[PDB]
């Protein structure tokens, strides 16, 4: 009823500068209303924490500020479960969904999957029992498998498969840092973890038990080059080690063992053709 996107941004930015003095008791009506509207827009996918523009990933720090203010301005309250009881300050996404709205929005939520309000879930996606945190964006035709986690602000592309127990790391702070990004058509194998704003580019295949943050060496065995923070598009990636200079030990790394071209970006068939 009051604010468009630039207004929201300014209201959020101004409130964030003085956040030290904001409490759930004293937060003003305009700030609260603006924070509420931003969360609603994140929830619907109308706004998103990061987005790819001119084919590059841009991060909207102000949307992270809004999420952080939502924590500041809300008190924890008792949350009635059935067999369990909870105590938290972030509402759940589907509290007001009925059959018509679930049918309209076009995704499936398999119990006991849970999603916080402020996260967008696109049509044709399936949430097996899993967790999707505030600020996340999960695009169309994606599978989030059992005990997987989509962290705060994470951007999951279309036709992605997050296998069982896969975690995509949240990034609220630092404000300037891009969230963790899985681009379109990626497969992430079971028990893998991609964190700290690492970008896995389109059409990549990551096997089981692969852990990649900003400190993880991503070894291109064909060239000997080492990547950090980015899995180039079409990469097939498995766990490995690199030897020490003394030869007495080796340390964990990811290894790019195959590269698939744009015009072709079968999971088991790719992994078969190794060595």
């Amino acid at each position: 009823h009051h604010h468009g996107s630039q207004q929201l941004q300014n209201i959020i930015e101004t409130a964030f500068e003085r956040r030290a003095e904001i409490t759930p008791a004293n937060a003003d009506t305009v700030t609260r209303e603006a924070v509420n509207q931003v969360i609603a827009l994140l929830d619907s996918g109308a706004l998103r924490v990061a987005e790819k523009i001119d084919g590059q990933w841009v991060t909207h720090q102000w949307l992270k500020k809004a999420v952080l203010l939502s924590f500041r301005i809300n008190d924890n309250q008792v949350i009635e479960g059935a067999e369990s009881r909870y105590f938290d300050k972030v509402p759940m996404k589907f509290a007001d969904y009925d059959e018509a709205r679930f049918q309209k929005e076009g995704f499936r939520v398999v119990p006991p999957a849970a999603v916080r309000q402020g996260a967008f879930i696109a049509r044709n996606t399936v949430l097996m029992p899993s967790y999707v945190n505030i600020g996340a964006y999960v695009d169309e035709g994606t599978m989030v498998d059992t005990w997987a986690t989509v962290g705060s602000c994470a951007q999951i592309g279309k036709n992605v498969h997050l296998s069982g127990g896969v975690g995509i790391g949240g990034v609220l702070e630092p404000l300037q840092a891009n969230p963790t990004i899985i681009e379109d058509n990626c497969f992430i194998g079971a028990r893998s973890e991609v964190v700290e704003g690492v970008i896995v580019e389109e059409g990549s295949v990551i096997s089981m038990g692969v852990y990649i943050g900003q400190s993880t060496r991503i070894y291109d065995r064909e060239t000997g080059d080492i990547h950090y923070g980015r899995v180039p598009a079409g990469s097939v990636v498995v766990s490995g080690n690199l030897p020490s200079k003394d030869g007495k030990y080796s340390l964990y790394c990811a290894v790019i063992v195959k590269k698939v071209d744009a015009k072709t970006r079968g999971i088991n068939e790719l992994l078969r053709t190794i060595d």
Copy 2:
């Protein structure tokens, strides 16, 4: 009231051939009834997706077809939670269980463990908070520990321990492929994953952080032989790597570090006696 096992099989097989034209709106009564009865039989353990015959694992593709048809013929509906709401087409196993039936069937379900209808849980097993998917068979005296997953169609033997965070991969497609099988008396260490129809034979001990699918080399260090798709009975298996030819890197594998005889198949004591 109508169909025995051969009839069910034919009804399922015939419906499956024409599945492209079957919707939740138009599915006929006989098909629906047959699909419902098959799910009930899978749920009770009276039928099972794979079984070991003349001491060999045989897969009943038609039971997978029935599970797949159950998805086709049922609409998603709103599923009321307490603090969360869901939207899915597969009912939960214990909806109609009372105290008498839980006492009769003889297992424990520790909250918030969840099991889909169409999965069999045998007596003396304990489900810590975990997930058991449709088509799975979990035999007697087994522990499914916290955040473990028993995937679709998976066969878990008697006296098995699935440690915390262990995933047993589902296999619905391809139809012909055996599901993931853990034979009797196996220990699977925390955070391990066994997928894609790999068979772990009786009395095996798999340590923590071991990931085995069809592409995973299982290195027998004693002989230099490489296994795929099968952990031979009595094997003690840990994570390792194999070196590249250039010596510049190594890649992930499982390693058989000890072999225990039939007449003897202590977990910490076995792992202690390494090197």
Copy 3:
């Protein structure tokens, strides 16, 4: 109304010696009352399974005996969920908590996190969706992240971060063995597992995908020394491998790659400064 700590200990110890003959039907009133009071004291943090004295970890076997007797003396009962139903003998911690008590005790429980009664959660801690088992102690200012597990009897120190999917192994048996201990100010990276009474000392930083039980070699690369069962205070630990004598394969280990002094014990900054 009846028993202090030494009385409780004797009542528990005496009952434990004759536990073979104790059933939920025949358990006497005094034993039941004593077991109930011990669980209450564990729940409130007034008693704890292990504690550090004269700066050393001492284990109270009798508290484990009380937990074990609580299992013996209680029948499983139906536990009403909403969309799911359960069947177990251990009550949940927050059944009788209201807003005032949650505010007093000072922690947050994010749905669907679950905690069994008999576990202590200190103020300023956050339980993301996770599991905390009976007998555990979780001290102040700690984060238990999504799909993490704090096992039975585990002692988690102040200002600890248990990242996503981290498991801290339970230790009820053997009775004499210390539980798994994470000392104050430790960071444990995603998907890591610390089990079997391993002690991670103060100010340690464990990266992602690190698995440490009593059989895991902890390799100090600076000295060539191998540790078992203990991560010395201030250690920075990553996954690695050690080569075999034949050079044909390597096996999993943890590697201490950096050591931080007492007077200084940034996570990404530490891991950056490797090699």
